[model samples]
Target: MSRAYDLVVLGAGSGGLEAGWNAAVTHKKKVAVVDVQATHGPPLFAALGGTCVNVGCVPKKLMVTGAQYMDLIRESGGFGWEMDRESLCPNWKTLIAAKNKVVNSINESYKSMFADTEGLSFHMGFGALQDAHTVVVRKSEDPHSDVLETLDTEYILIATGSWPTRLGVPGDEFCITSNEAFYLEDAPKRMLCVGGGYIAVEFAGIFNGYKPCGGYVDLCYRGDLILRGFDTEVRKSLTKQLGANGIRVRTNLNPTKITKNEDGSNHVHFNDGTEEDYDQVMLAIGRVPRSQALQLDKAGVRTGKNGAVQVDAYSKTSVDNIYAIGDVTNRVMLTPVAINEGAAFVETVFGGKPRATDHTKVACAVFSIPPIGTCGMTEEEAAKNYETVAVYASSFTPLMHNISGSKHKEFMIRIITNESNGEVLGVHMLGDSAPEIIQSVGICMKMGAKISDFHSTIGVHPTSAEELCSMRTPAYFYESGKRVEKLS
Candidate 1:
């Protein structure tokens, strides 16, 4: 009932898979990856490639792309390509089926890769730490059942990732998260997106853009604004932009409780004594590290605040031969960040290199109605870190919006710099190009590019990206956390 491996990964997620890939293929280390084959879904469908592939980014972005057809349809009219205007409708089931298809395809690809790898194997079962070098695999359905297999590993990893934490209130089970959202047959007619962060706003945008033809959607957040940690201007701009897309954004209102209506809808009560009925109530509030069941006590692996596996700069856990990565460590919770950590862990442990993954100035994006992308320091962070910081804020309508006749705010771009040195501290943007533009900006920040260097570069004409390179003057400067050098 036992097998041995040079490495055992307890979650076949993005990071874990890559770690196993590099270990088995690159370093020729025998690796075994264990993940849950849920009792509810097919074994292969529920195992391997975990969240990013099976439910999170891939399918979520596909839904976002489907939600964008209306913008395209409106813009197409400007280009003299007029099709049937009265009959265009977004099909929920069609997009759902297609996105699921892609998810399954990726799941299969991961399975095939493992099959082809020299010394890597994928196991379908839940894994718990028996000790520093032993992983006990059991059926997820009945944990007390006879052991399926035991893995004796030289190095162990807990890359189990995180799970959506539900708002523990009356009738909390009436809510859904992205994991359930992807599997729903039809998009809800009316949805209440409850949270202020990226997941809540993104789904709110998705719901508003989706719908049969036009449907009611509400983004309810207790905070005054969504995207709390982002730059003030971009946060404020996206608030307006969300409204422009017809989402009834209810700020400073907390969900008190939820109840089931006679019509099979959700009746949500708020702290302000306001109540609304919704076909679906989605809780994108937050997620917690999925490290509880691993029984870290058995292995003496220490965890950090919020039950996340505590790792050093190189992702080594408290246990000598055990490590953790991706969302389980609760670092930067992006897909690319996890992949980088995976590669870095492989190189450090197996490839005879000591590599520590960089966490600063990382790029992130939110797929809200207008969307947003940012890198490096926020104005608050920059002002606090440096003596004087120059801030540039630009608001413009994209050329397409001018002709397309869409009223949404097309772009809000900001740049923060070290005033004395002109070193670019941060860059943020809002629009379709935001996600793509911010990625390259991350590289610029890493290279310590200055604002003068940005200005010196020639810009591609009549493009949204061109604006970033051409902005020459500072709107204002913050000195010692005090506003100074106003352009007036």
Candidate 2:
């Protein structure tokens, strides 16, 4: 197929799809979304709705929920719900089946949307730059394969996104990345995960969640687990809470080799003069741009020292008529951030009005044993920016857990304020409903809400939500970590 589009989006992942949709729908420009998958496409291992729906957000959250359910059952005895020892098993097959079905349904929705939209074509092939202003879509597996499609466009958008970074050491292939973690066939009796980042922490949380009550999961993180680098108290508290949940954490240790034993299990050797055995080993060191094979050099698109595509404020690459967005660009790799960047890119370059990406207060959630919702500056940032920053926060069991009588139920709420102007610099929380709650807090910050505004707002009582306003004491202070702010 040979066709020219006003805009050609290479990779229909979050940024690519959003760019295509906006170019066609909002800007009234002809566009196409191309991908490498045999079907519609799988960008970011993302399901139909993109990464959030497919692999990263949805599956990760599902596993977190599954893990939390196990925690709930363990404490059910206190809530007067008898959980028999026999009912404690986690059925990986069932959960994974449900997750796959969710992905498939979303994939259908994405295709349906593309079909319904006018002037937007969906191509199933890998897209490469034929030139700065054009793209060549190669067939599924044909190296000498004829061009499945070619499009000349006024603008070319590259949104291929990111991939997992492997451990530098040997036996890397034996280790799996988070990209394939949700699809594991059977639950392993023993699990080994390295790295202190969220991928490792969250996966470790899921493993701990899978263990039945009175069981334990071993994690081989090389540093402190759950390294939020935020409110020290909150990080420390959450780490402690996670530890109490039965995940045995190993710090200051790195795995050197993972050899498959004759029995099919794995023997893991660490640098700390220790050896251990586990069913599977996961390496979650980090993710790098998936731009390696794209051959950006041929297209004259320059990448930064970190290897991310260098884009300007408008998300345009160095090459004229070519731009990069999403994880490949690394401005902010969150799905929503990518979506906004993609949409804004189309509007600016092709739409009637030009737009640029603006990041004020970004909110994100961590799917740990107890989830976290946070936005704006961390306490560390607040301390650096403001000489006298007050911290007001609270931690307690939510009302829902009252009936559960579980001691493990704990929540954290933190607010950082510049004492001079009482400006709310940061809001962070970890606990029940934090994922949603932190979002609203971030919005309030974006709206320029002040500390005085928080005080003026009436409190919603008896719910964990109200605790945000009721804080009267500092969870702790910093004069180099001195001064108590308030906690009511």
The candidate that achieves the highest TM-score relative to the unseen native structure: 1
TM-score to true structure, per model: 0.96, 0.91
Which lDDT values do the candidates have, in the order given? Answer: 0.83, 0.75
Q: Give the TM-score comparing model 1 with the true structure, all chains together.
A: 0.96
Q: Write down the lDDT that model 1 would get.
A: 0.83
Error of 2 at 205 (Å): 2.1
Worst 10 residues of 2 by lDDT: 38-47
lDDT of 1 by residue, 222-334 (tens): 78978889988889888887787778898898888889989898898898998888899888888799887888887899976778988999999997789999999997898
Summarize candidate 2's per-residue lDDT along 1-488 as a digit string, tens digits. 24477778778878788888877887678887787653222333543345455667777888888888876886676767774658457877888788778766767777888879998888776677766776877774333567787777778888888778897776778887787677677776787777777788788899777754344576666666456455667677777777787777777789887777888888877888787877778888877886766667777989775679998988878877788888888767788888889878877877758898878788888788888778888777777656677777767776666677666768878888776567888888888788888888878888887777876778888677777777655555544344654343
- Candidate 2 has a TM-score of 0.91
Clashes (N, CA, C under 3 Å) per candidate: 0, 13
How far out, in Å, is residue 118 in model 2?
Answer: 1.7
Each prediction's RMSD to truth: 2.4, 3.3
lDDT, residue 123, model 2: 79
